[PDB]
Amino acid sequence: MLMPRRMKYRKQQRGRLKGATKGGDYVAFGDYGLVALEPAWITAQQIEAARVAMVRHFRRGGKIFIRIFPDKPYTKKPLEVRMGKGKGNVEGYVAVVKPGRVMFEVAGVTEEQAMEALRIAGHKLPIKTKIVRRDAYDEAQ
């Protein structure tokens, strides 16, 4: 799928989502990027679906950069079970995304293909997106 090979701990506390991405806000790799506008937990099955959606779109073409990674475990109790008796079992992993985060990047692809590409990938994401270019996104120094 797209989980981590090993982890010191298998289940971990839920947490929260205070706006601002902290990091990952500029392009820095490809030419066009997809930036998250709402905060959320993106399941690896979505990251995946979106990715495949792009390669599928411009089959045999440019390069894709997945800027996020699902390292946070998702717990879910069984069905018809009551509360308590311990924490649920891990059902998958998710990457936490905050507003401003550049989730994906593309390169070696026409500006038409780039747009269309990311527009399809955002239709697989639980949130709202924005497509970007490159310019001040040059924190080289």
Binding site: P78, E80, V81, R82, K85, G86
Partner: protein, 83 residues
């Protein structure tokens, strides 16, 4: 319907220990007053300060606690007498 469940082998924890500094800089103390409770040597005994088996720090004379941070050498708790 009540569909059976399991449990966890977790659930333990040990009593709180109340470790930490007990007297702060500029505070008057008497001989014996424990000034700090710590596990390692988070603080080093200074001028007129003793250290028990469990690293506890106590005043050796009757004075006013003072703190001194000595970079790579560590942090010290001294007890300045009314001298």
């Amino acid at each position: 319907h009540k569909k059976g469940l399991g449990s966890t082998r977790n659930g333990r924890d040990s009593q709180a220990k109340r470790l930490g500094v007990k007297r702060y800089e500029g505070q008057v103390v008497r001989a014996g007053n424990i000034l700090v409770r710590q596990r390692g040597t988070r603080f080093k005994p200074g001028k007129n300060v003793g250290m028990g088996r469990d690293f506890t720090l106590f005043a050796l004379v009757d004075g006013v606690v003072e703190f001194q941070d000595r970079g790579r050498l560590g942090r010290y708790v001294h007890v300045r007498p009314l001298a």
